[PDB]
Tab-separated table of C-alpha atoms and ligand atoms in Angstrom:
chain	number	residue	atom	x	y	z
A	87	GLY	CA	106.935	136.635	78.927
A	88	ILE	CA	107.054	139.853	80.129
A	89	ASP	CA	107.533	143.238	78.414
A	90	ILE	CA	108.221	146.818	79.405
A	91	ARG	CA	106.668	149.689	77.947
A	92	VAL	CA	105.641	153.349	78.770
A	93	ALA	CA	102.485	153.515	81.038
A	94	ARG	CA	99.547	155.598	79.852
A	95	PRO	CA	96.248	157.052	81.950
A	96	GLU	CA	94.042	153.983	80.755
A	97	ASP	CA	96.651	151.597	82.825
A	98	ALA	CA	95.338	153.451	86.363
A	99	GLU	CA	92.977	150.734	86.475
A	100	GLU	CA	95.126	147.851	86.686
A	101	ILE	CA	97.915	150.080	88.507
A	102	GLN	CA	95.534	151.238	91.314
A	103	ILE	CA	94.218	147.502	91.824
A	104	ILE	CA	98.178	146.334	92.416
A	105	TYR	CA	98.543	149.710	94.713
A	106	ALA	CA	95.748	150.073	96.943
A	107	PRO	CA	96.332	146.505	99.169
A	108	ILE	CA	99.790	148.283	99.692
A	109	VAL	CA	98.447	151.263	100.822
A	110	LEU	CA	95.525	149.594	103.265
A	111	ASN	CA	97.521	146.896	104.633
A	112	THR	CA	101.177	147.364	104.592
A	113	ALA	CA	103.910	149.835	105.619
A	114	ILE	CA	105.544	149.224	102.460
A	115	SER	CA	103.715	153.056	101.481
A	116	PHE	CA	103.485	155.706	103.892
A	117	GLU	CA	100.001	156.842	102.403
A	118	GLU	CA	97.331	156.033	104.637
A	119	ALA	CA	94.117	156.503	102.547
A	120	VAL	CA	93.671	154.024	99.615
A	121	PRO	CA	94.165	156.156	96.488
A	122	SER	CA	91.440	156.195	93.644
A	123	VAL	CA	91.546	155.041	90.166
A	124	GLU	CA	91.048	158.732	88.986
A	125	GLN	CA	93.761	160.092	91.477
A	126	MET	CA	96.419	157.163	89.953
A	127	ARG	CA	95.158	158.382	86.677
A	128	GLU	CA	96.170	161.784	87.200
A	129	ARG	CA	99.394	160.730	89.022
A	130	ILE	CA	100.302	159.231	85.828
A	131	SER	CA	99.743	162.173	83.439
A	132	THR	CA	101.371	164.420	85.569
A	133	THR	CA	104.567	162.235	86.203
A	134	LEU	CA	104.597	162.004	82.268
A	135	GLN	CA	104.767	165.637	81.861
A	136	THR	CA	108.396	165.381	83.270
A	137	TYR	CA	109.369	161.666	84.344
A	138	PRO	CA	109.379	158.120	82.784
A	139	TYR	CA	106.520	155.960	84.111
A	140	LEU	CA	106.570	152.653	83.334
A	141	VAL	CA	104.663	148.933	83.248
A	142	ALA	CA	105.469	145.817	82.779
A	143	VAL	CA	103.002	143.649	80.985
A	144	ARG	CA	102.178	139.816	80.417
A	145	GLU	CA	99.590	138.757	78.282
A	146	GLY	CA	98.323	142.134	77.783
A	147	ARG	CA	98.082	142.691	81.946
A	148	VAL	CA	99.835	145.209	83.873
A	149	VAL	CA	101.890	142.965	86.444
A	150	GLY	CA	104.140	146.090	87.808
A	151	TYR	CA	105.059	149.609	87.523
A	152	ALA	CA	107.480	152.034	87.950
A	153	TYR	CA	107.984	155.934	87.759
A	154	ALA	CA	110.934	158.288	89.072
A	155	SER	CA	109.943	161.821	90.628
A	156	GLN	CA	111.546	164.493	92.364
A	157	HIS	CA	113.807	163.755	95.444
A	158	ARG	CA	114.108	167.232	96.654
A	159	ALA	CA	112.709	170.788	95.821
A	160	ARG	CA	115.860	173.011	95.780
A	161	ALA	CA	117.772	173.979	92.508
A	162	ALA	CA	120.714	172.006	93.297
A	163	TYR	CA	119.345	168.789	93.663
A	164	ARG	CA	117.705	168.812	90.234
A	165	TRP	CA	120.403	165.913	89.321
A	166	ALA	CA	118.950	163.926	92.193
A	167	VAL	CA	115.900	161.789	91.073
A	168	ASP	CA	113.519	159.561	93.150
A	169	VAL	CA	112.548	156.136	91.946
A	170	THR	CA	109.340	153.679	92.884
A	171	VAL	CA	109.081	150.241	92.001
A	172	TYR	CA	105.635	148.012	92.465
A	173	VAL	CA	104.944	144.440	91.422
A	174	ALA	CA	101.561	142.826	91.698
A	175	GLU	CA	101.219	140.029	94.523
A	176	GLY	CA	101.771	136.517	92.970
A	177	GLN	CA	104.016	137.862	90.594
A	178	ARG	CA	107.127	138.781	92.563
A	179	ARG	CA	110.794	137.032	92.663
A	180	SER	CA	109.955	136.363	88.959
A	181	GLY	CA	112.250	139.100	88.255
A	182	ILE	CA	109.692	141.948	87.268
A	183	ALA	CA	111.197	144.832	89.420
A	184	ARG	CA	114.963	143.705	88.067
A	185	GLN	CA	113.408	144.215	84.383
A	186	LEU	CA	111.446	147.468	85.313
A	187	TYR	CA	114.861	148.959	86.645
A	188	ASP	CA	116.965	147.531	83.986
A	189	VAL	CA	114.637	149.997	81.556
A	190	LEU	CA	114.323	152.496	84.225
A	191	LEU	CA	117.534	153.276	85.237
A	192	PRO	CA	119.616	153.823	81.855
A	193	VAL	CA	116.450	155.879	80.427
A	194	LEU	CA	117.436	158.480	83.685
A	195	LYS	CA	120.979	158.220	82.751
A	196	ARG	CA	120.697	159.576	79.391
A	197	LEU	CA	117.992	162.336	80.591
A	198	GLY	CA	120.939	163.755	82.570
A	199	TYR	CA	120.373	162.492	85.981
A	200	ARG	CA	123.463	161.636	88.268
A	201	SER	CA	121.828	159.449	90.980
A	202	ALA	CA	118.643	157.924	91.613
A	203	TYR	CA	117.504	157.089	95.101
A	204	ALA	CA	115.027	154.128	96.340
A	205	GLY	CA	113.136	154.521	99.831
A	206	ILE	CA	112.479	151.263	101.314
A	207	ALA	CA	110.233	150.934	104.442
A	208	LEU	CA	112.576	148.342	106.590
A	209	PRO	CA	112.637	145.496	107.173
A	210	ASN	CA	112.064	144.542	103.579
A	211	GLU	CA	114.600	142.147	102.752
A	212	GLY	CA	113.544	141.173	99.573
A	213	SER	CA	113.614	144.541	98.552
A	214	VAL	CA	116.924	145.467	99.924
A	215	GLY	CA	118.567	142.236	98.146
A	216	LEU	CA	116.898	143.326	94.885
A	217	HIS	CA	118.690	146.822	94.963
A	218	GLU	CA	121.700	145.249	96.351
A	219	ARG	CA	121.734	142.939	93.326
A	220	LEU	CA	121.208	146.023	91.207
A	221	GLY	CA	124.142	147.733	92.426
A	222	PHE	CA	122.130	150.344	94.941
A	223	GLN	CA	124.248	151.688	97.791
A	224	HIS	CA	122.878	151.593	101.476
A	225	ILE	CA	123.270	155.436	102.347
A	226	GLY	CA	121.623	155.751	105.371
A	227	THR	CA	118.229	155.015	107.397
A	228	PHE	CA	116.055	157.186	109.121
A	229	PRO	CA	115.061	155.383	112.097
A	230	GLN	CA	111.019	155.028	113.222
A	231	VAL	CA	110.500	158.004	111.115
A	232	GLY	CA	107.098	156.642	110.430
A	233	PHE	CA	103.680	155.550	112.047
A	234	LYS	CA	101.610	153.038	110.527
A	235	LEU	CA	99.564	150.252	111.185
A	236	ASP	CA	100.422	150.617	115.071
A	237	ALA	CA	104.287	150.546	114.464
A	238	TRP	CA	106.937	152.767	114.262
A	239	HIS	CA	108.924	152.210	110.961
A	240	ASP	CA	112.813	152.720	109.880
A	241	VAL	CA	113.166	154.084	105.951
A	242	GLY	CA	116.533	153.272	104.521
A	243	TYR	CA	117.367	155.025	101.439
A	244	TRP	CA	119.503	153.064	98.545
A	245	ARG	CA	121.361	155.170	95.880
A	246	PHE	CA	122.212	154.238	92.296
A	247	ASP	CA	125.336	156.248	91.355
A	248	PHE	CA	125.085	157.156	87.072
A	249	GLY	CA	128.538	158.702	87.627
A	250	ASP	CA	129.582	161.408	85.185
A	251	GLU	CA	129.667	164.098	88.363
A	252	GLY	CA	131.620	166.357	86.035
A	253	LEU	CA	132.414	169.554	86.149
A	254	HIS	CA	129.841	171.196	84.188
A	255	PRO	CA	126.689	169.331	84.156
A	256	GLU	CA	123.641	170.515	82.324
A	257	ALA	CA	120.352	170.592	83.442
A	258	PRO	CA	118.368	167.154	83.142
A	259	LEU	CA	116.024	166.488	79.808
A	260	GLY	CA	111.978	165.895	80.029
A	261	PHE	CA	111.112	162.375	79.186
A	262	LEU	CA	109.646	162.929	76.063
A	263	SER	CA	108.548	166.893	76.685
A	264	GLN	CA	108.944	169.590	79.406
A	265	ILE	CA	111.342	172.361	80.603
B	42	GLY	CA	124.189	188.299	125.363
B	43	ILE	CA	121.528	187.348	122.929
B	44	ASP	CA	117.841	186.637	122.921
B	45	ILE	CA	115.809	184.453	121.179
B	46	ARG	CA	112.117	185.468	120.228
B	47	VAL	CA	109.304	184.472	117.727
B	48	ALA	CA	109.930	185.799	114.126
B	49	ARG	CA	107.686	188.321	112.604
B	50	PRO	CA	107.354	188.965	109.005
B	51	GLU	CA	108.911	192.557	109.608
B	52	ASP	CA	112.532	190.777	110.518
B	53	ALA	CA	112.669	189.935	106.986
B	54	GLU	CA	114.994	192.301	105.276
B	55	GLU	CA	117.289	191.260	108.424
B	56	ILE	CA	116.863	187.471	107.883
B	57	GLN	CA	118.123	188.096	104.143
B	58	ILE	CA	120.953	189.900	105.175
B	59	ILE	CA	122.165	186.674	106.639
B	60	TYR	CA	120.400	184.332	103.861
B	61	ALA	CA	121.180	186.105	100.853
B	62	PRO	CA	124.795	185.854	100.928
B	63	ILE	CA	124.312	181.694	102.032
B	64	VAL	CA	122.761	181.537	98.573
B	65	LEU	CA	124.833	183.359	96.459
B	66	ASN	CA	128.490	182.093	97.690
B	67	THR	CA	128.111	179.137	99.976
B	68	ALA	CA	126.241	175.671	99.922
B	69	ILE	CA	125.167	175.794	103.056
B	70	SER	CA	121.774	176.508	101.163
B	71	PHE	CA	120.712	174.442	97.614
B	72	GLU	CA	118.529	177.748	96.836
B	73	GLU	CA	120.544	179.241	93.890
B	74	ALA	CA	118.548	182.823	93.584
B	75	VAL	CA	117.725	184.637	96.355
B	76	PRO	CA	114.245	185.288	97.717
B	77	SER	CA	112.725	188.754	97.105
B	78	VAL	CA	111.883	190.666	100.487
B	79	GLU	CA	108.320	189.706	99.839
B	80	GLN	CA	109.045	186.170	99.119
B	81	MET	CA	110.775	186.120	102.690
B	82	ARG	CA	107.668	187.823	104.259
B	83	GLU	CA	105.424	185.031	102.983
B	84	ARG	CA	107.780	182.356	104.213
B	85	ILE	CA	108.326	183.601	107.552
B	86	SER	CA	104.104	184.080	107.755
B	87	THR	CA	103.694	180.906	106.235
B	88	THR	CA	105.911	178.315	108.252
B	89	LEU	CA	104.108	180.625	111.634
B	90	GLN	CA	100.867	178.952	110.449
B	91	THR	CA	101.702	175.854	112.239
B	92	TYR	CA	105.397	175.572	113.045
B	93	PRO	CA	107.711	178.012	115.254
B	94	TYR	CA	110.080	180.497	113.370
B	95	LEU	CA	112.714	182.421	115.317
B	96	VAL	CA	115.107	184.632	115.360
B	97	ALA	CA	118.372	185.337	117.293
B	98	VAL	CA	118.893	189.135	118.394
B	99	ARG	CA	122.243	190.429	119.723
B	100	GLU	CA	122.116	194.413	120.538
B	101	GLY	CA	118.353	194.608	118.994
B	102	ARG	CA	119.945	193.077	115.178
B	103	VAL	CA	118.938	189.684	113.987
B	104	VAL	CA	122.003	187.879	114.029
B	105	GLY	CA	120.420	184.146	113.482
B	106	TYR	CA	117.406	182.499	112.786
B	107	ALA	CA	115.648	178.718	113.018
B	108	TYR	CA	112.397	177.474	111.626
B	109	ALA	CA	110.785	174.018	111.551
B	110	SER	CA	109.406	172.579	108.224
B	111	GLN	CA	107.398	169.367	107.190
B	112	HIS	CA	109.757	166.397	106.781
B	113	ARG	CA	107.736	164.250	103.980
B	114	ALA	CA	104.512	165.033	102.499
B	115	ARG	CA	103.230	161.491	103.129
B	116	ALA	CA	100.791	161.143	106.240
B	117	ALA	CA	102.477	158.536	108.014
B	118	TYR	CA	105.245	161.045	108.558
B	119	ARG	CA	103.634	163.591	110.254
B	120	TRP	CA	105.466	162.955	113.482
B	121	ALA	CA	108.850	163.713	111.640
B	122	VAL	CA	109.751	167.487	111.407
B	123	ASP	CA	112.686	169.111	109.628
B	124	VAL	CA	114.715	172.014	111.436
B	125	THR	CA	116.719	174.926	109.955
B	126	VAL	CA	118.984	177.048	111.810
B	127	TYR	CA	121.397	179.826	110.107
B	128	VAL	CA	123.913	182.424	111.616
B	129	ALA	CA	125.446	185.338	110.463
B	130	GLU	CA	129.273	185.045	109.895
B	131	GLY	CA	131.585	186.246	112.838
B	132	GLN	CA	131.271	185.974	115.905
B	133	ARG	CA	129.206	183.599	118.737
B	134	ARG	CA	128.586	181.176	116.148
B	135	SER	CA	128.013	178.202	117.848
B	136	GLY	CA	126.597	180.050	121.069
B	137	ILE	CA	123.693	181.554	118.872
B	138	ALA	CA	123.083	178.240	117.102
B	139	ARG	CA	122.801	176.075	120.189
B	140	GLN	CA	120.750	178.819	121.928
B	141	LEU	CA	118.213	178.716	119.045
B	142	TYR	CA	118.123	174.886	119.352
B	143	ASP	CA	117.647	175.188	123.122
B	144	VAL	CA	114.365	176.867	122.443
B	145	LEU	CA	113.298	175.291	119.089
B	146	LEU	CA	113.639	171.839	120.465
B	147	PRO	CA	111.634	171.838	123.567
B	148	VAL	CA	108.752	173.649	121.360
B	149	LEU	CA	108.898	170.970	118.990
B	150	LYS	CA	108.529	168.263	121.857
B	151	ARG	CA	105.789	169.812	123.426
B	152	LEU	CA	103.821	170.277	120.040
B	153	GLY	CA	104.085	166.260	119.860
B	154	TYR	CA	106.564	165.779	117.226
B	155	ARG	CA	108.810	162.360	118.013
B	156	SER	CA	111.894	163.411	115.791
B	157	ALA	CA	113.804	166.426	114.006
B	158	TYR	CA	115.979	166.388	111.096
B	159	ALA	CA	118.396	168.964	110.309
B	160	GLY	CA	120.417	168.497	106.737
B	161	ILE	CA	124.215	169.663	106.856
B	162	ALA	CA	126.065	170.239	103.314
B	163	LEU	CA	129.439	168.438	104.206
B	164	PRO	CA	131.960	168.750	105.363
B	165	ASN	CA	130.902	171.338	107.917
B	166	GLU	CA	132.895	170.447	110.973
B	167	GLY	CA	131.710	173.342	113.113
B	168	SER	CA	128.399	172.583	112.330
B	169	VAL	CA	128.602	168.635	112.940
B	170	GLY	CA	130.291	169.022	116.286
B	171	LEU	CA	127.369	171.649	117.081
B	172	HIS	CA	124.756	168.497	116.637
B	173	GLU	CA	126.573	166.253	117.937
B	174	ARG	CA	126.890	167.979	121.466
B	175	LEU	CA	123.058	168.791	121.207
B	176	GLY	CA	122.479	165.012	121.089
B	177	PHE	CA	121.900	164.760	117.321
B	178	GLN	CA	122.802	161.409	115.809
B	179	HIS	CA	123.883	161.157	112.459
B	180	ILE	CA	121.828	158.817	110.111
B	181	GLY	CA	122.690	158.938	107.034
B	182	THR	CA	124.737	160.810	104.170
B	183	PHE	CA	123.570	161.501	100.763
B	184	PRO	CA	126.651	161.501	98.385
B	185	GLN	CA	127.349	164.131	95.811
B	186	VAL	CA	123.864	164.599	95.722
B	187	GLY	CA	123.864	168.709	94.817
B	188	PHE	CA	125.906	170.453	92.602
B	189	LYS	CA	126.574	174.072	93.250
B	190	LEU	CA	129.197	176.959	93.102
B	191	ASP	CA	131.583	174.429	90.512
B	192	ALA	CA	131.277	171.028	93.063
B	193	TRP	CA	129.109	168.347	93.944
B	194	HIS	CA	128.257	168.636	97.494
B	195	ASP	CA	127.035	165.471	100.155
B	196	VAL	CA	124.416	166.272	102.358
B	197	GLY	CA	124.213	164.508	106.167
B	198	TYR	CA	121.219	164.039	108.283
B	199	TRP	CA	121.320	164.389	111.683
B	200	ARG	CA	118.402	163.228	114.142
B	201	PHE	CA	117.056	164.366	117.268
B	202	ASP	CA	114.970	161.507	118.957
B	203	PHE	CA	112.543	163.158	121.244
B	204	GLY	CA	111.442	159.868	122.489
B	205	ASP	CA	107.719	158.878	123.165
B	206	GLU	CA	107.816	156.689	120.120
B	207	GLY	CA	104.682	154.646	121.733
B	208	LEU	CA	101.586	153.112	120.779
B	209	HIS	CA	98.832	155.493	120.275
B	210	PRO	CA	100.591	158.674	119.027
B	211	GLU	CA	98.459	161.877	118.780
B	212	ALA	CA	98.724	164.214	115.883
B	213	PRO	CA	101.059	166.911	116.190
B	214	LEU	CA	99.565	170.572	117.280
B	215	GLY	CA	100.255	173.844	115.352
B	216	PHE	CA	102.454	176.185	117.157
B	217	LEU	CA	100.085	178.897	117.848
B	218	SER	CA	96.736	178.078	116.120
B	219	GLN	CA	95.599	175.323	115.191
B	220	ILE	CA	96.780	172.784	112.509
C	481	LIG	C1	108.027	154.899	102.879
C	481	LIG	AS1	107.363	155.819	101.498
C	481	LIG	O1	105.720	155.623	101.479
C	481	LIG	O2	108.512	154.989	99.744
C	481	LIG	C2	107.914	157.806	101.434
C	481	LIG	C3	107.933	158.675	100.195
C	481	LIG	C4	107.028	159.614	99.829
C	481	LIG	N1	106.928	159.416	98.386
C	481	LIG	C5	107.268	161.244	100.529
C	481	LIG	O3	108.047	161.717	99.772
C	481	LIG	O4	106.337	161.459	101.132
C	482	LIG	C1	121.844	171.504	101.655
C	482	LIG	AS1	120.284	171.892	102.036
C	482	LIG	O1	119.487	173.749	101.531
C	482	LIG	O2	120.805	171.906	103.675
C	482	LIG	C2	118.817	170.598	101.673
C	482	LIG	C3	117.511	170.717	102.436
C	482	LIG	C4	116.446	171.648	101.004
C	482	LIG	N1	115.534	172.673	102.055
C	482	LIG	C5	115.294	170.846	100.611
C	482	LIG	O3	114.323	169.967	101.125
C	482	LIG	O4	114.393	171.015	99.491
C	483	LIG	NA1	112.654	159.998	105.238
C	484	LIG	NA1	118.877	164.689	100.222
């Protein structure tokens, strides 16, 4: 099945349902307090002001989502972008994150980004495997950088290189809008 | 013989003599516009509400400075802290930076952080060797992540481990006045 489409604020509810147990009971995310539905709604809208936000859907329900965000604040970094992907429990390994990425990555390239970074709390062999298969390269690991759920956690970064690190790059454009 | 003291907003114009050419003509900082003196005042003053900010003085004039800043926004990262040290061109480069860190690092340890991170625009043999002798470890490099002054630049990160990654860490305390 599976169709990828642009996310909407109305997807907040299913997205929150996917994301809340990840915040609650895993070190996948370094957030501590479960974000409300209303919060995820605002995160969707704000992200869309500049970046793609995507959902994967199967028979009308959201089974995963993906979005991009700013890699770092300072001007010279503006060709670097962060990517985030999540899949509902029980729908993993069925290729959903892969499909999300196969849409998100080309979108980012055409916007003007030169590289995308995925932050992965380690260990997570299934997430590493997926990024290795997609062609990301592991460029570094911040060891025991986070504390959550009674343990210290490594965070590795995986880089997808869009190429075209040419000599006169132009600033990336808005997904659908702003400058 | 160079002395280290905590910085004050009234040091802004002297700090700027150091920062301005770094911004205008090096990749040492990925900022592109020189902050106004008013901005520098607010930066120093804002950092101090929670973090140490230091200057190195030789014959009464600021020849270098250093400050800590938040590593990442998410709650689980609150024991990680970023460090930044800049030194004027000319004499005693390494000595100045070393003395700065010899004060900054122990201050951050006492405050309750578990690790500090320095980002280095690469190559920079002088800075790398300095971090290495201070006991930092190179944990990753973000290749071609920034574009500035007609080239793409890698940024490597060096980690200072304060130890004490125990099971019940208490949140870090504010440098002079609570966080
Ligand atoms: C291990 As993780 O929860 O993917 C940390 C990334 C977070 N967006 C931050 O920058 O603070
Ligand atoms: C190359 As560099 O100015 O050492 C990168 C750090 C920058 N402060 C940021 O995090 O935005
Ligand atoms: Na990190
Ligand atoms: Na970076």
